Each structure stands twice: as structure tokens, then as C-alpha cells.
Design an enzyme around this catalytic site. Structure first.
Site, mmCIF file in Angstrom:
data_model
loop_
_atom_site.group_PDB
_atom_site.id
_atom_site.type_symbol
_atom_site.label_atom_id
_atom_site.label_comp_id
_atom_site.label_asym_id
_atom_site.label_seq_id
_atom_site.Cartn_x
_atom_site.Cartn_y
_atom_site.Cartn_z
ATOM 1 N N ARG A 1 43.363 41.544 48.640
ATOM 2 C CA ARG A 1 42.310 41.276 48.993
ATOM 3 C C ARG A 1 41.696 41.277 50.358
ATOM 4 O O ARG A 1 40.700 41.620 50.878
ATOM 5 C CB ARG A 1 41.921 39.723 48.286
ATOM 6 C CG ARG A 1 42.325 39.697 46.783
ATOM 7 C CD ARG A 1 42.209 38.448 46.225
ATOM 8 N NE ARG A 1 43.487 37.605 46.589
ATOM 9 C CZ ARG A 1 43.619 36.482 46.322
ATOM 10 N NH1 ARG A 1 42.796 35.659 45.544
ATOM 11 N NH2 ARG A 1 44.933 36.012 46.664
ATOM 12 N N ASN B 1 41.044 38.834 42.562
ATOM 13 C CA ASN B 1 42.252 38.923 41.336
ATOM 14 C C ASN B 1 41.853 38.474 40.217
ATOM 15 O O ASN B 1 41.231 37.555 39.940
ATOM 16 C CB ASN B 1 43.282 37.918 41.990
ATOM 17 C CG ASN B 1 44.202 38.505 43.170
ATOM 18 O OD1 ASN B 1 44.999 37.809 43.720
ATOM 19 N ND2 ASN B 1 44.101 39.732 43.332
#
Length: 96
Positions: free
Chosen positions: A21, A39
Site C-alpha cells: 500500500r 487491502n
């Protein structure tokens, strides 16, 4: 071209718990893209990209082949690719 596109993505493989991320946000910002990364609940990473078409395409290749340094990407699925005339976002966010 010098058009703008939006595209949805979902990345499969060793893609969670590998700073994916953080690296996705950094690469998106470097490329002048807006959108998001998150996620998922099924062990993948997803989001949307928007910006200049060449920059989005560069990011798509990055999402297919590289990601974060310790990731192992088996597949990037892209969906809903389309030309846009305005951006829907003002930043590239990591969605918790």
C-alpha cells in the site's frame, strides 16, 4: 495520448504484508495519479487509478510486474477502463 483514464485494479499473489500500500501510494503520487489502494478481505490489493493515460499505463505495468520490492505478483486484473474528463479524487489515498 494526452487524455485521462480511470481503471480499477486488483492484484493477486504475495501482496499483503509487504508494504504494497505504501509503495503503491508513493508510485501513484510520483506519476501524478489520484485514486486509492486498499487491502481486500480476500488477501488481495485493490483500488482505482485516474490521471493522464500514459501515466496510468505506466502504473498498470508497475502493478503487473513490480509492486513493492518484496511482493510477488501473480496477476493484476484490470476492469472498467474508461476515458474521463474530470478527476474523481484529489489525492492518492491508502484506505484502511
Amino acid at each position: 495520448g494526452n487524455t485521462l483514464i480511470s481503471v480499477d485494479y486488483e492484484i493477486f499473489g504475495k501482496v499483503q504484508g509487504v508494504f504494497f500500500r505504501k509503495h503503491t501510494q508513493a508510485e501513484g503520487k510520483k506519476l501524478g495519479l489520484v485514486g486509492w489502494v486498499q487491502n481486500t478481505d480476500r488477501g488481495t490489493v485493490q483500488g482505482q487509478l485516474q490521471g493522464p493515460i500514459s501515466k496510468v499505463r505506466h502504473m498498470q505495468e508497475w502493478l503487473e510486474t513490480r509492486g513493492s520490492p518484496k511482493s510477488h505478483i501473480d496477476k493484476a486484473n484490470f476492469n472498467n477502463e474508461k476515458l474521463i474528463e474530470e478527476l474523481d479524487y484529489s489525492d492518492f489515498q491508502i484506505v484502511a
